[PDB]
Amino acid sequence: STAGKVIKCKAAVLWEEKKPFSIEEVEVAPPKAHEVRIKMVATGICRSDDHVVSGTLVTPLPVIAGHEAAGIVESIGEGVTTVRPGDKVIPLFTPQCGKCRVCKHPEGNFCLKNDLSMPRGTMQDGTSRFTCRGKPIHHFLGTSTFSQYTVVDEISVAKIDAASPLEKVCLIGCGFSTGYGSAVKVAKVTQGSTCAVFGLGGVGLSVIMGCKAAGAARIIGVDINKDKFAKAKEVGATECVNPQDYKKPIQEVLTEMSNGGVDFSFEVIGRLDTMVTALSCCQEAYGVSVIVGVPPDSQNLSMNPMLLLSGRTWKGAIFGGFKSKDSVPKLVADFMAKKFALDPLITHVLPFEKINEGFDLLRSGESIRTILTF
Amino acid sequence: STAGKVIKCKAAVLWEEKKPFSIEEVEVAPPKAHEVRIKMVATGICRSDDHVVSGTLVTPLPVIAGHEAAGIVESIGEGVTTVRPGDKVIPLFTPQCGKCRVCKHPEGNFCLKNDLSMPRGTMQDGTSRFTCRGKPIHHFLGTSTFSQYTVVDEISVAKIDAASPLEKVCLIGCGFSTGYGSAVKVAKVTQGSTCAVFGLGGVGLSVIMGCKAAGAARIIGVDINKDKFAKAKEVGATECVNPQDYKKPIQEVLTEMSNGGVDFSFEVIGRLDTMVTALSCCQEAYGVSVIVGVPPDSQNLSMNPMLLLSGRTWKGAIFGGFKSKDSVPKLVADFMAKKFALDPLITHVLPFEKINEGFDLLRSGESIRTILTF
Numbered sequence: 001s002t003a004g005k006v007i008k009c010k011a012a013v014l015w016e017e018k019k020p021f022s023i024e025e026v027e028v029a030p031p032k033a034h035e036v037r038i039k040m041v042a043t044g045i046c047r048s049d050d051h052v053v054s055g056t057l058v059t060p061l062p063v064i065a066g067h068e069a070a071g072i073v074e075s076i077g078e079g080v081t082t083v084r085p086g087d088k089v090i091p092l093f094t095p096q097c098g099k100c101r102v103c104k105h106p107e108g109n110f111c112l113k114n115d116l117s118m119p120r121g122t123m124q125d126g127t128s129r130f131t132c133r134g135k136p137i138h139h140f141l142g143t144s145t146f147s148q149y150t151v152v153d154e155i156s157v158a159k160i161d162a163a164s165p166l167e168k169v170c171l172i173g174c175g176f177s178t179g180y181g182s183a184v185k186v187a188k189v190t191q192g193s194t195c196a197v198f199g200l201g202g203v204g205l206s207v208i209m210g211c212k213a214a215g216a217a218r219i220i221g222v223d224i225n226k227d228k229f230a231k232a233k234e235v236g237a238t239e240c241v242n243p244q245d246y247k248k249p250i251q252e253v254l255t256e257m258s259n260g261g262v263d264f265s266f267e268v269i270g271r272l273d274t275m276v277t278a279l280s281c282c283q284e285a286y287g288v289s290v291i292v293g294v295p296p297d298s299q300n301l302s303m304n305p306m307l308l309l310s311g312r313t314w315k316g317a318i319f320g321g322f323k324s325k326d327s328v329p330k331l332v333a334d335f336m337a338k339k340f341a342l343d344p345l346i347t348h349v350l351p352f353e354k355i356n357e358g359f360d361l362l363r364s365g366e367s368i369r370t371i372l373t374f
Numbered sequence: 375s376t377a378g379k380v381i382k383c384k385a386a387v388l389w390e391e392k393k394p395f396s397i398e399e400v401e402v403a404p405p406k407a408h409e410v411r412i413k414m415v416a417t418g419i420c421r422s423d424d425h426v427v428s429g430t431l432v433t434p435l436p437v438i439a440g441h442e443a444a445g446i447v448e449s450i451g452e453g454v455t456t457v458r459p460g461d462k463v464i465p466l467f468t469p470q471c472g473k474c475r476v477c478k479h480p481e482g483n484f485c486l487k488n489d490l491s492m493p494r495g496t497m498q499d500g501t502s503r504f505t506c507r508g509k510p511i512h513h514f515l516g517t518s519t520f521s522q523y524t525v526v527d528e529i530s531v532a533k534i535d536a537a538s539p540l541e542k543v544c545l546i547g548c549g550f551s552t553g554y555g556s557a558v559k560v561a562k563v564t565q566g567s568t569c570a571v572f573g574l575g576g577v578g579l580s581v582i583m584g585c586k587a588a589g590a591a592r593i594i595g596v597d598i599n600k601d602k603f604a605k606a607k608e609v610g611a612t613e614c615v616n617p618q619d620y621k622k623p624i625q626e627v628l629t630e631m632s633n634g635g636v637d638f639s640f641e642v643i644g645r646l647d648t649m650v651t652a653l654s655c656c657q658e659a660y661g662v663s664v665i666v667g668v669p670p671d672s673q674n675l676s677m678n679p680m681l682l683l684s685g686r687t688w689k690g691a692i693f694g695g696f697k698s699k700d701s702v703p704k705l706v707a708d709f710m711a712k713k714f715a716l717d718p719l720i721t722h723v724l725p726f727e728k729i730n731e732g733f734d735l736l737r738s739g740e741s742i743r744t745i746l747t748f
């Protein structure tokens with residue numbers, strides 16, 4: 001609660017890979033010049049947080065993962081000008097300093113002040129703000145939402161409507177924005193088109209939501225988990241296909257289904273094989289393929305360049321192509337006006353303490369988005 | 375010679391790979407329904423015809439190669455309505471049937487009636503038209519321009535200006551159009567942008583040409599052949615770099631001089647390695663890399679997908695994204711209106727009979743385009 005000095009609270013520390021999270025008592029230091037201390041309220045568990053544990057996404061340990069949340073400004077640091085104490089807010093794993101090359105660029109959004117290309121696991125000061133035992137804990141994407149209190153650089157935080165249901169709205173901190181943005185912003189799905197979405201998780205279902213918004217005619221969901229097909233159909237999919245039901249490669253199935261290939265295909269899983277399969281399944285001469293999922297640390301993929309030479313465009317995108325600060329509050333507003341629904345993504349809600357259970361639900365396949373409340 | 379039946383003439387037949395062309399006598403058969411027989415006046419030597427001789431580009435031998443040329447209609451077949459005997463024309467290696475899904479699509483240009491994805495070496499009806507010695511000979515991309523006379527289907531021929539200079543306009547058959555289109559049409563170079571072009575041959579120089587037309591503020595040329603530089607700077611290049619002069623990876627070099635990467639890179643050589651180096655050297659969040667060169671048959675390239683996750687867009691294109699039949703006439707017009715110059719690309723003009731010498735020049739590095747005359 002209240003402060004101007006070190007706060008002691010509970011956080012979900014990950015000490016080693018492939019191990020459960022240890023909810024421990026951490027000392028969260030006060031915000032410095034241009035930083036804000038936020039009292040967390042809810043956090044969605046995304047597969048990227050899971051990649052940290054399984055070691056697919058290399059970032060320094062010990063660490064406090066988490067990047068999809070909504071909280072409340074507990075205090076403000078020297079120089080802050082964009083938020084104030086008591087303000088509802090959303091941390092931003094993709095920052096927007098407003099000064100670098102990309103921020104200037106009217107299209108690019110992968111801000112040069114991010115901690116994703118080369119994780120230091122720090123505050124921009126190059127310092128940590130957490131300590132457990134006596135040891136300093138790293139930050140994740142300068143967000144670290146698996147904690148009652150976290151401190152973010154102003155560059156990495158966005159003010160949201162005071163009437164927002166922080167428990168719903170946290171999905172806009174990643175899952176929905178990344179997925180919905182891939183469809184509408186990065187691939188620019190056209191009306192009457194035909195799309196194919198590989199991966200029916202919380203981000204994948206969001207991509208389907210975006211294709212429906214963008215007026216697509218057919219939305220083919222693809223997943224090796226038949227159970228996902230209901231939600232997929234409920235949020236827009238015109239049909240779902242399970243690769244395992246077939247005796248021929250899914251590209252062939254998809255091309256034939258779409259008489260020649262899909263207009264837009266999306267990879268929202270994170271593995272080398274589906275990325276290429278998704279590319280190949282779209283129309284050879286003008287199909288667009290967008291890589292949305294996060295692949296394993298240092299793995300290369302092999303592909304035949306003639307796939308491109310014909311006329312195919314392959315892209316990738318972080319955070320749905322959205323300029324972070326500008327977009328999250330505008331998105332939250334659209335939610336408020338009821339232009340899209342988040343409920344369909346939310347399968348579970350557990351108290352933060354049951355964090356490990358939420359990840360088990362993820363990994364087992366019974367959940368889409370499980371929200372942890374504080 | 376005029377006619378209504380077989381015309382016995384001369385041509386360069388490639389009987390076996392990695393062997394010179396044999397200039398000999400072939401029998402060119404009269405055009406069937408919707409076919410046009412054409413008397414050739416001039417042809418350019420592109421690297422793709424060399425790929426055929428090297429076996430890098432697989433197409434059934436024996437074959438009569440050649441894809442960039444211009445000539446005059448000697449005769450037409452039953453049902454033709456878009457050309458007449460006496461008309462100047464350019465045979466299109468990328469057809470435009472106007473009926474298929476790609477042709478009806480606003481941006482696609484790779485017609486579904488092309489003989490490039492699965493090369494049969496024939497004509498629309500699956501039958502040849504050339505006989506040498508006594509055995510039938512194959513067609514190349516439906517054009518086969520290294521012959522005094524050839525036959526093409528109505529969908530692979532465009533009528534051009536009756537006043538156009540054929541030993542010039544023949545470069546629009548491939549080299550210019552494909553290179554100019556890659557910049558202007560495919561990548562869509564923006565004014566003020568920083569471009570990079572790997573490979574300074576006829577096709578590369580034309581890409582430079584288009585970048586200038588697009589308003590590129592910086593256009594860097596990369597080549598291991600130092601002697602190409604002058605002609606590059608001459609047609610638009612601002613700088614020229616020779617990878618072999620540095621002790622560090624070319625992408626490091628290119629990313630530093632462009633302060634974090636170029637806006638648009640083009641691969642116009644045809645190698646797996648440079649298609650990746652071109653991709654990496656462009657800005658991570660919004661850079662665009664276009665593949666123009668033709669890779670070796672069934673070779674795959676390895677690459678790290680994070681490159682795309684950042685925000686980069688990778689594309690490829692045939693004939694510069696140009697819908698063949700309607701664009702070629704319009705491009706010839708712009709030539710007539712002095713909108714662009716083809717003269718800097720032409721370093722030699724040899725008699726058709728000296729086709730071998732032309733190829734040797736190409737291969738020795740001291741040529742850009744050699745025009746062969748009939």
Ligand SMILES: NC(=O)c1c[nH+]cc([C@@H]2O[C@H](COP(=O)([O-])OP(=O)(O)OC[C@H]3O[C@@H](n4cnc5c(N)ncnc54)[C@H](O)[C@@H]3O)[C@@H](O)[C@H]2O)c1
Binds near residue numbers: 047
């Ligand atoms: N680009 C970004 O900004 C970004 C942000 N957050 C998450 C991501 C990534 O997106 C990916 C999805 O995240 P999520 O929705 O939270 O994940 P979630 O794990 O809920 O969904 C993954 C889905 O893919 C399915 N799947 C797995 N293997 C296959 C397969 N081989 N073939 C077909 N289907 C398969 C699986 O059944 C599951 O439903 C993951 O890699 C996550 O790290 C990217």
Ligand SMILES: NC(=O)c1c[nH+]cc([C@@H]2O[C@H](COP(=O)([O-])OP(=O)(O)OC[C@H]3O[C@@H](n4cnc5c(N)ncnc54)[C@H](O)[C@@H]3O)[C@@H](O)[C@H]2O)c1
Binds near residue numbers: 576
């Ligand atoms: N996409 C299409 O529709 C299309 C049509 N025709 C040809 C092409 C292809 O375009 C490519 C170029 O044609 P071209 O302009 O006739 O060939 P040309 O040989 O004239 O150009 C090749 C140039 O690349 C240079 N080069 C070689 N190695 C390197 C290297 N390692 N690094 C940098 N530069 C290098 C080389 O010195 C030469 O200057 C070729 O691969 C051809 O097969 C594409």
Ligand SMILES: [Zn+2]
Binds near residue numbers: 067
């Ligand atoms: Zn995420």
Ligand SMILES: [Zn+2]
Binds near residue numbers: 097098
């Ligand atoms: Zn920035």
Ligand SMILES: [Zn+2]
Binds near residue numbers: 420421548549
């Ligand atoms: Zn060519």
Ligand SMILES: [Zn+2]
Binds near residue numbers: 472474477487
């Ligand atoms: Zn067509």
